[model samples]
Structures are given as C-alpha cells and as structure tokens.
Target chain A: QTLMLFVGVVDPSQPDRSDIRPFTEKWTQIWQSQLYNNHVDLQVFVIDDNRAIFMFKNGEQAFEAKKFLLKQEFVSEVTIEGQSFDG
Target chain B: SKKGQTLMLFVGVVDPSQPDRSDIRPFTEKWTQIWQSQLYNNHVDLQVFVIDDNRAIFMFKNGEQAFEAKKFLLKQEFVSEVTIEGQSFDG
Candidate 1:
C-alpha cells in the first residue's frame, strides 16, 4: 500500500523550534518502537514544509501509523488514500 | 424515506496503447461540486472514494438523487463512459 506523509512546519523560518522536534522525535520513536515480528516495511522521506513520505507494506499499517501521528498536537492534518484499517 | 441510498461505482480503464495519463480529476471534481450543491440544498448525504487510478465509488443517501447526479455527470463531454449499480429502500 502507498502512504503519503505531509508534515507541516508551523514556522518555516524558525527551524530549531521545539514544535518541530517532537514530530520528528515521535516519528522516529514510533518506527523504532515497532516489534520486529510485524510484516510491515516502512519507507520514510522528508518532502519539505515538514511533509514526509511514508510508504508501507500495506494499507493496514499505513493507517495505523497515520492514526498514531495524528494524535500528537503538532500534526495539523492527516489524509489517508481512503478509509483506514484502524477506522 | 431516508432509509436507503444508491451507490454508483465507476471504473475507467486506461488505454495502455495511449501514452497520455487518464484525466480523472475532472469527473472527481465535477461529482464533488454536484454533491456539494446537493448538500447545500439539503437533498442528500453523499460520500465519494477514489479507490485507485482507474476506479471511483460514490454513495448517496437515496437512489433517485444518485441517479440524478449520475445523469448530470454522464452528459459531460469528457466522460468516456459510465456504469451504475443501485438498491432501493424497500428492497
């Protein structure tokens, strides 16, 4: 499944702000926190203005990751391709 | 009654022989506009999903409204073709 991650930086001028770090930190933490047994493989890349690219093994895991990131205060919007597995 | 609505699913096949990418955005935007208009008029609740490059699914609150929107879109000059499936409230 294909998952697109768009991370929006609230203030582009201030690159060192605390708000941006949490999202980056949380993103790394979540990826590292996953158990090895899960058959999902994720590819992530930054796509400007805090936007990131996240490609998952399937739709289910993509939805799972999207949901987790959305819960954080830093994320403004999350748009999955369609209905998510977590829904 | 508001008990049932029709779901119209349309799938367009991209001609492998043609080099141009399929122009599906028009239909998607058109349907979205129509749905929004209906919503403003308080006619129905409409939801649309784009499954992939070649398929789109739409659900309307009822069959009649669905048909109405379908007919409106089918007449568009850009639409290659359309197929419809529906269910009635009583059934």
Candidate 2:
C-alpha cells in the first residue's frame, strides 16, 4: 500500500480576488477518477484559507492526477509526499 | 500499532446561537497536556488548528488512539459534534 499527500496553499489575503472554483474542479476530477478505481481511498483536510491537504492511497495514480492539476493556471504550488506501506 | 496514520477531527458547533459562550482556552490547554503526556509520551507532535470560530482540527500521529480519546471528550459539556475517521473496518 502507498499514500500520496498533496498540499495546496490558497492565499487568504486576496479574498476578493481569490477563486476556489479551480481548486474544486480539480478536486472533483481526481475524486471521481479515484473513486472509480475501487482500490484507493482519498481524504481531504481543509486546513484553512491558505492550506489544504489531500491523501491518496495510490502513489502513481496520485502523481498522474496531481501532474494534470499542477498545469492549471490558478494554482500557486503543489507539493507531493509519497509513502509506501511495505517498509 | 498502526504507525504513520493521520486522523482528522471535524468539530461542529452544537449550538450555533450560543457558540462563543464555551470557554475553549482551558479545554485547549487540557487537550495539549493530555496529548503530550499520554498520547505522545512527551514526543508526539500535536497540531491544533481552529478552522473557524466554532470548528477545530486536531492532527495526531496515532489515528486510532485519537478516536479513542474522543470518547472521553464527549463526556464534557462543551462538546457538540465529533467525527472520527477510519473507524469502521468494514468500510
């Protein structure tokens, strides 16, 4: 088993100018794909206006999904933390 | 013991109308001490964040133990909503 952690930081200083639609769209896309795979689990943690964490059970799948998302125009930065279960 | 697991706790205000009346400072202090002494053995890292005025998130390394601790906290009067993750093995 493996887990991939993705963290996204949204700027709270720009509430009027900030838009979370892009974030939500990407999240929805990944969630739909992963949920259909049947072997992976996804968890989301909304830390605050500036920080959020997403956990995925498949590293490769998460990487692919995240890669597609990082290309989006609205994201500031995306960090991935990978861990394997068979240590 | 299941190591490297994360637990996310979502606390909702039981009474939205009278939310500020609950004294959270003391409860927060007690929670900090309990986690440090009992959960972490003085080593575990505890990240407590207030997501909003009424919601708080407690990030603990031991996900299972954190679920166990919630049982004790529910006995308190201030607790309104408590949700545990990864509890149902069948799921």
Candidate 3:
C-alpha cells in the first residue's frame, strides 16, 4: 500500500530567517530522522533561494505526519493538493 | 483510512486590488493571535499557509469551525472577502 502524501513548504519569513539552506536542511533531516524515522520516506528539494519542499509519504501515515508537521515551527504550509496516490 | 479528517478554511480577500493587504495583515494577525491560542486547548489546529502576504488558508478538523472562523473574519473592516473551497476528502 502507498502511504498518503503531504507536502510541507517552508515559510522563509519566520524568526528572521538568515540561512535558508541550513534551516530547511534541518527540517528535512528532522522529519527523516527525529520525527518520521521509519514509517515515512521523505525528500528535500530546493525550489528557490528562500524556500524548500518536503515530500512526505502519505495515506496510512499521513494523519500522524500531517498533524506533526502542522504543529511544528516554520512549517508554513502543508497540502495534499497536487499529490499523487498510487493504487 | 478512518483517520482524523479536516475541513480547510481559506481566509482571503476580494479583488479590484481592493483594501491593500498591507493594512489587512495587521488585522489578520490580531485575529490569529487569539485563534492560535485555542487550538491546543480544544485539541484542534488550523494550518496557516499564508499569514501576511495575502489571503491565509486555515485548515480545521471541523467544517463548522472553518465556517465559524470565516464568519468572524468577514466582520472586520479592512478584511475584504473570505472563502474556503477545493474541499473533497479528509485533509
């Protein structure tokens, strides 16, 4: 079964963001290790100079992952829009 | 999946380049300052997509609350329009 997915986009304006890559890298790593661990397969992508995209595996684990990311700091936005679900 | 489904609230303004968002941001922040506090206490949270840039999308686990927050924002003076759409499955 494919895990439902959620995309977490970084909000660069939070807490006086200075170093963009480092901050987003930390988030991507955090989800991959500290938060998501094994249940999720995540990826980090650089869309522009100040923003990042974290693609999260969703479906069964989406609820937990979605809520966790929503509550986290600097997570800006999370949406299922444009996400693909496999059958 | 029998999971925690949510209705996302899209809080935005109208067109005509009306009521500059620069002023609207202050009002929106004032409103969210209060709104942000209750999410934890009531076991509910709203995902904020955009805060000061323009229209903010606040997703809620409850549809009623989505409409509820939308209704509250509409009363403000600087606030133009608030609408929530593109809802189908559990968010």
The DockQ-based CAPRI class assigned to model 3 is incorrect
Predicted candidate 3 versus true structure: per-residue lDDT over B27-83, tens digit per residue:
566555455454435555455545334556565545556666666667755456676
DockQ preference between candidates 1 and 2, better one:
2
Off by over 4 Å in 3: A1-87, B1-5, B13-18, B21-31, B35-45, B86-91
Clashes of each: 2, 0, 5
- For model 1, what is the error of residue A15's alpha carbon versus the real structure, in angstroms, after optimal superposition? 46
True-vs-predicted CA distance for residue B73, candidate 3, Å: 1.7
Clash pairs for candidate 2: none
Q: Considering every candidate listed, which one attains the maximal TM-score? A: 2
Worst 10 residues of 2 chain B by lDDT: B82-91
Error of 2 at B88 (Å): 14
Off by over 4 Å in 1: A1-87, B11-20, B23-44, B87-91
Q: Give the C-alpha miss distance for residue B82 in model 1, angstroms.
A: 2.0
Worst 10 residues of 3 chain B by lDDT: B82-91
For candidate 3, write residues A1-87 as lDDT tens digits: 223334444555655553566666556566656544555654444332344344443545555666777777767666543232111
Ten residues in sequence with the least summed lDDT for candidate 1 chain A: A78-87
* Model 2 ranges off by over 4 Å: A1-43, A46-51, A55-87, B1-4, B13-45, B86-91
